[PDB]
Design a protein around this ligand. Structure first.
Ligand SMILES: [Mg+2]
Ligand SMILES: [Mg+2]
Ligand SMILES: [Mg+2]
Ligand SMILES: [Mg+2]
Ligand SMILES: [Mg+2]
Ligand SMILES: [Mg+2]
Ligand SMILES: [Mg+2]
Ligand SMILES: [Mg+2]
Ligand SMILES: [Mg+2]
Ligand SMILES: [Mg+2]
Ligand SMILES: [Mg+2]
Ligand SMILES: [Mg+2]
Ligand SMILES: [Mg+2]
Ligand SMILES: [Mg+2]
Ligand SMILES: [Mg+2]
Ligand SMILES: [Mg+2]
Ligand SMILES: [Mg+2]
Ligand SMILES: [Mg+2]
Ligand SMILES: [Mg+2]
Ligand SMILES: [Mg+2]
Ligand SMILES: [Mg+2]
Ligand SMILES: [Mg+2]
Ligand SMILES: [Mg+2]
Ligand SMILES: [Zn+2]
Lengths: 78, 116, 136, 60, 177, 51
RNA sequence: GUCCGGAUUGGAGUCUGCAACUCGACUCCAUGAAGUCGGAAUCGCUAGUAAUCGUGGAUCAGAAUGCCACGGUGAAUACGU
RNA sequence: AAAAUGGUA
RNA sequence: GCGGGGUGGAGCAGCCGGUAGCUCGUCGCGCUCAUAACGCGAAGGUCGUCGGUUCAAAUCCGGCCCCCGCAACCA
RNA sequence: CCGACUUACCAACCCGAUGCAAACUGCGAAUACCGGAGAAUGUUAUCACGGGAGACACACGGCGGGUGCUAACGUCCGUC
RNA sequence: CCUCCUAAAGAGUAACGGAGGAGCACGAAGGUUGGCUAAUCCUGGUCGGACAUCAGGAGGUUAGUGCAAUGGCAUAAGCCAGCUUGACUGCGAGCGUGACGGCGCGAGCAGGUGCGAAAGCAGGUCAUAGUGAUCCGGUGGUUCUGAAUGGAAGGGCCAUC
RNA sequence: UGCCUGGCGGCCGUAGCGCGGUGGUCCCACCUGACCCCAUGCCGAACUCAGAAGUGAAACGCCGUAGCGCCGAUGGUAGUGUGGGGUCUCCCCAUGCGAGAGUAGGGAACUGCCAGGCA
């Protein structure tokens, strides 16, 4: 017989691009994600597709914060 | 709860003022008194504070819960900030409507010298 | 013949059967049939081994079956090649790892369960052992 | 109360059959006349045997 | 305000001693009276709901709120967001004015009035009654009546349970059987 | 699908136009928007026209 | 669907009869149903007839809308086979 | 215009 | 393996969701000495069986069973 | 109209105990990967640009798997 | 083309492996300001019923998201209203992802705008599917070119089909 | 300086629920009146304004109390990188890393700035 499966989609290469303590330039993507699995901290913005990017030069910093224990990514100035 | 539902109304603007790193003028309103605090951008240190519970302000007021009292607190908190060189804040209505006593307090603070 | 009444997915990966078992003590009865070896228990075997116990004791006492056949096993028919999709589900098995207690019995003398479990163990493809409840 | 969306709510006079007069506010407009009220209703005021039928009818 | 004065002057002192309440704030109050009118027959003709609406406004002297279906239900053939009812909420002064008319003018007009059930408290002190005939309120002109409407009256009380809710209504000589 | 293309022509007479899509069958009214005309560098009214 | 209609039902009774439960007739009060002229089809009637209105009698203690008689008012139509 | 049939003695 | 289906008692519709139809048959009344034909009136499936989706399924989707057709080849 | 018993009986939600999961997770490694610092070692082993290619039929073995019958010197991936 | 698993806790990763979807919709379903909070069940309540509207309680997001699945979402991205056109024009540090063609994210700058008292937010929509190179040609703008010269045809550039 | 209260924070359940008690000088809350500033797709319920008769009933704050939630070792166990081995669908040994669950136990948060009241 034949198969009713067989389809898929090309991988989107999501995930963390710069890790903890990495020096980044402004506007450099830190994490590509579906939804805010990570949240924007200081000097960090969020794109329309929920991409997080640096808004200043500095180091990437991950921290759990807030009453919901959500993960935040902030930039620490050099 | 009124107090909880007001905190929910307040936190959307408060988090935004955290990302901007702005000096925050926080107004609190009760049926009997009105309050004002200028808070450092970190959020944990109070620069100046004026309220109707202080004898310096309440003594010259017939009632401390009217709009004429809110203009008294707004004027006093602005002068105290000006002598400490703040002069540039962002108003946090803190969940109340910008209307009546809250508006009257901001209007006094504006014409007295604070830029917001 | 045990089988899930409904399942979200019809087929399942083969997987592996590593490790030891969870559920090694006698929990509901006083005597148990424990699995010493590793393998699969087919729902027909569980039905056949349960019928041997339940007539050996003549339906006096109570039987607990501790394993359930929830993993579907598919086979391709005869004389078809490879490939052309995954086969059709034909039966269901339970994965059994060493120490797994398969049955429990209560309300019987020990000598009657040791005989009843011996008849059941003749229908199972796994090495088994007779075990009893411990105070802890 | 918003303006010009509500029925007109003006003081009326309610005069009952039992002589009770009550001043209320309502939308009816005219004077109202009551045939019954809470001061004259049977339930409000408090105004609400086979052998015995046999013996009475069949005296012996 | 005749019953508001009656409540503030005689009801409270009655309920002060009956339940030995520490504070006057502990005595139950009447919060609101909600009049409901299920006009489920408005799916056929929308006019009926508006006809029922002006009937309810004349009862309460207050424009009603045309309510609409929360979710679509198959059995009754309604879609979510269709107007299938109306309601009024009476508070403060209008609550007391209407409550007097219901007690003293309307409920004596209920056909074959044998009293009001004392079992109709939902367990938290709120009394819900049902009116079969809108003609029991003199605001509705019997000549002008197009269709027999009914309506649902509910009294929301501060009371913490049924038993002290029953007492508060009884203080207004509510006609329980 | 059933949502076909239209062009919004500026009222400034510059000939600049925006292009969008409209559902004719449910919104048959002509579309009027106040877009930015880069020829006059001002926000003017754009009137719908056929593509 | 009425001041039409008077079925049904509840209560109170009368009389006959040893005896009105099954199962009598009538009276009073209350109730107030179907029914708004009836499909295919079908019946009687030519003059004091049809239609309509009352009355009496036999049977019979009681029990007729039936049967058998009596009068009152009183038509239409018959070209033709 | 249309009209089919009738168990036995 | 692939296409079609299962709906009053029978044969066919209705399948794009809402509100089941036609012919015969069946039943009651009429016509007839009686039956047939004929005339009038009415009843009868809640859609093969389950699951899913939906506000809602004969209808859409998926399994199951039944009944059918096409194909089941080259050495 | 209500309703009353009874159970070859079946059984929801909740509670306690017991398991199962590639498309379950209130947990959670080892490794691997990304970045920074430091030492030693390594014929720069790295990267960029330019000249010339060849190759794009792989095989088996270990480990992790899909498929098959945890069949195949089977088939399809990952990694050595 | 999109979602999940396989896929071995960075990315990526095959099979006629296992499951589903797309070839759109919306001038509001977009922007902003102001507000609000679900499913379900229980109790009481006129018609009214298992299920309509109403009141209270428990519950705690089990709802909702324009359409699949996943990841999100209470500061709500969910629900309601007012005013609106930022579903703007020229650019763009820097980065991600691709053999490439290409695809994506983006603070900030200039011009003009909307909402807001303001701080601000807005270059479409919770995000990820809704798509088709070049050639050839059509329509509008722009003399950039214009085969002796002045035009014009035709071409170019810009917008679009 | 102590006790108390309000605001803004840090932290994000050892901090949250439950249960029982306690607070009104001040503060806070309910509370009082609404033609008004403003508002309800009806409603002064909410938002809002002008107040201060009453009450700490509710809400909130504080205190106590493990019924929960929550935290949580030590030891062992599972897994696993590297090398080797077997009876090789699975395991064992040397070495390194080492859970989850559960157990003993902890646990009725801690704290910064400002303001006010009483002492
Ligand atoms: Mg009568
Ligand atoms: Mg009738
Ligand atoms: Mg008539
Ligand atoms: Mg004759
Ligand atoms: Mg007669
Ligand atoms: Mg007689
Ligand atoms: Mg024959
Ligand atoms: Mg190849
Ligand atoms: Mg290979
Ligand atoms: Mg090979
Ligand atoms: Mg990966
Ligand atoms: Mg990996
Ligand atoms: Mg590869
Ligand atoms: Mg949207
Ligand atoms: Mg908002
Ligand atoms: Mg939005
Ligand atoms: Mg979306
Ligand atoms: Mg020329
Ligand atoms: Mg041209
Ligand atoms: Mg108030
Ligand atoms: Mg209290
Ligand atoms: Mg542990
Ligand atoms: Mg506590
Ligand atoms: Zn009266």
């Amino acid at each position: 017989g034949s198969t009713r499966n067989g389809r898929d989609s090309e991988a989107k290469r999501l995930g963390v691009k710069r890790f903890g303590g990495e020096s980044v330039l402004a506007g450099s993507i830190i994490v590509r994600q579906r939804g805010t699995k990570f949240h924007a901290g200081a000097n960090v913005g969020c794109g329309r597709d929920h991409t997080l990017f640096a808004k200043a030069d500095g180091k990437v910093k991950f921290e759990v914060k807030g009453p919901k224990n959500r993960k935040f990514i902030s930039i620490e100035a050099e | 709860d009124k107090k909880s539902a007001r905190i929910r109304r307040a936190t959307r603007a408060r988090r935004k003022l955290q990302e901007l790193g702005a000096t925050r003028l926080v107004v609190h309103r009760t049926p009997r008194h009105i309050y004002a605090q200028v808070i450092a951008p970190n959020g944990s240190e109070v620069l100046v504070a004026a309220s109707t519970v202080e004898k310096a302000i309440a003594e010259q007021l017939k009632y401390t819960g009217n709009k004429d009292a809110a203009a008294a607190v707004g004027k006093a908190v602005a002068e105290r900030a000006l002598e400490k060189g703040i002069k540039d804040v962002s108003f946090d209505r803190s969940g109340f409507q910008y209307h009546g006593r809250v508006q009257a307090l901001a209007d006094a603070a504006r014409e007295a010298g604070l830029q917001f | 013949m045990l089988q899930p009444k409904r399942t979200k997915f019809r087929k399942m990966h083969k997987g592996r059967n590593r490790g030891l078992a969870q559920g090694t003590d006698v929990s509901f009865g006083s005597f148990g049939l424990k699995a010493v070896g590793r393998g699969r228990l087919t729902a027909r075997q569980i039905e056949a081994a349960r019928r041997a116990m339940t007539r050996a004791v003549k339906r006096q006492g109570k039987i607990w079956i501790r394993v359930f056949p929830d993993k579907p096993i598919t086979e391709k028919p005869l004389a078809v090649r490879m490939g052309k999709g995954k086969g059709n589900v034909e039966y269901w098995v339970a994965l059994i790892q060493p120490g797994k207690v398969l049955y429990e019995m209560d309300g019987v003398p020990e000598e009657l369960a040791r005989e009843a479990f011996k008849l059941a163990a003749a229908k199972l493809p796994i090495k088994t052992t007779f075990v009893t409840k411990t105070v802890m | 109360m918003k303006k010009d969306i509500h029925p007109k709510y003006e003081e009326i006079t309610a005069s009952c059959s039992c002589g009770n007069v009550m001043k209320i506010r309502s939308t009816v407009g005219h004077d109202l006349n009551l045939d019954v009220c809470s001061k004259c209703h049977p339930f409000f005021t408090g105004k609400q045997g086979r052998v015995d039928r046999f013996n009475k009818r069949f005296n012996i | 305000a005749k019953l508001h004065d009656y409540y503030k002057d005689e009801v409270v002192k009655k309920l002060m001693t009956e339940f030995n309440y520490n504070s006057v704030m502990q005595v139950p109050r009447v919060e609101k009276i909600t009049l409901n009118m299920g006009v489920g027959e408005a799916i056929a003709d929308k006019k009926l709901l508006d006809n029922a609406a002006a009937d309810l406004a004349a009862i309460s002297g207050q424009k009603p709120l045309i309510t609409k279906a929360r979710k679509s239900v198959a059995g009754f053939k309604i879609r979510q967001g269709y107007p299938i009812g109306c309601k009024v909420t009476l508070r403060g002064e209008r609550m007391w004015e209407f409550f007097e008319r219901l007690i003293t003018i309307a409920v004596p007009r209920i056909r074959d009035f044998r009293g009001l059930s004392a079992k109709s408290f939902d367990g938290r002190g709120n009394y819900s009654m049902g009116v079969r005939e809108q003609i029991i309120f003199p605001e509705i002109d019997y000549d002008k009546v197009d269709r027999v409407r009914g309506l649902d009256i509910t009294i929301t009380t501060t009371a913490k349970s049924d038993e002290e809710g029953r007492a508060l209504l009884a203080a207004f000589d509510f006609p329980f059987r | 699908g059933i949502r076909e293309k239209i062009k919004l022509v500026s009222s400034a007479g510059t000939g600049h136009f925006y292009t969008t899509t409209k559902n004719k069958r449910t919104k048959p009214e002509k579309l009027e928007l106040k877009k930015f005309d880069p020829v006059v560098r001002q926000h003017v009214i754009y009137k719908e026209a056929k593509i």
